[PDB]
Amino acid sequence: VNPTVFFDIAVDGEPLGRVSFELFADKVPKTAENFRALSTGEKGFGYKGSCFHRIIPGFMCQGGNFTHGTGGKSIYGEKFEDENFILKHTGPGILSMANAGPNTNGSQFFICTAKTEWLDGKHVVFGKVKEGMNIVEAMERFGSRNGKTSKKITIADCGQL
Amino acid sequence: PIVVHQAISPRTLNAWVKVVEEKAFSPEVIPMFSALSEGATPQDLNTMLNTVGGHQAAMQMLKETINEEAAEWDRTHPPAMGPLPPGQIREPTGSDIAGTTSTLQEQIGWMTHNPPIPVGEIYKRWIILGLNKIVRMY
What we know:
The complex is a heterodimer. Chain A is α+β, with helices and mostly antiparallel strands. Chain A has a single domain (1-161), classed as Cyclophilin-like (Cyclophilin, Beta Barrel), CATH 2.40.100. Chain A is 12% helix and 29% strand. Chain A contains two helices and eight strands. Chain A has an eight-stranded antiparallel beta sheet with strand order 3-4-6-5-7-2-1-8, with helices on one face. By secondary structure, chain B is mostly helical. Chain B has a single domain, classed as Orthogonal Bundle (Human Immunodeficiency Virus Type 1 Capsid Protein), CATH 1.10.375.10. Chain B starts with 9 loop residues before the first helix and ends with a helix. The relative contact order of chain B is 0.18. Chains A and B meet through loops of A and loops of B.
């Protein structure tokens, strides 16, 4: 039921490591499916070659703006509704939707690097890191309190396992 | 006013109510408003405006101007992508600046941010534009 996808991460074009994710299709099928299809590129656009544009050490790593600042698009149109808030931001590894307010999901997502309970009920949790959390932890060091990254952190490849 | 929040003075409200009611002061309504709202939070501004009895049509007309300015703010200030970092609140929406959807504590947070997000001064600008219409008409 639950698909698994991978990112191969690169730092300034140099391979860093693979991160895999379990997507919670069983609980948030619509949200899982958007991220799954964007990972395979099967609609003809997606995460491959996009960057982690906002990394805040001790909080989260954010990416998925593959259109350029609010950018990106879902597989259903530009934005979609918050599916549910059943699942919580319980710790590092949690994969959750970025948004600009209620019912504004597109393509942007984030990986928690800590327990972030104040996001519960505001961001839709739809997966978690399976393998490669130490890569996510390494990626944190390229961030700033600002979110500005010190290097180009990119998704060199991605797909479904 | 921020000075820590401090309640607006009783007779700041006095000045104001007594400047609204009397026609001879009509040209000084706007300047008086400016002078009486120094360092005002949006909550302070709403308290001041809403203390005035017997001018309901004017006050409804002002609110329409305010609501227009709030929507124009939103048009030119799309919300930032979250998630919000710990300890950080949202950039203010138009209704937040007008004090309708924000709390005093959020207003204080914005106004004392480094650098300041001057929600009192912004709202004051909207009110002054509305007061211009009502000075002209009522």
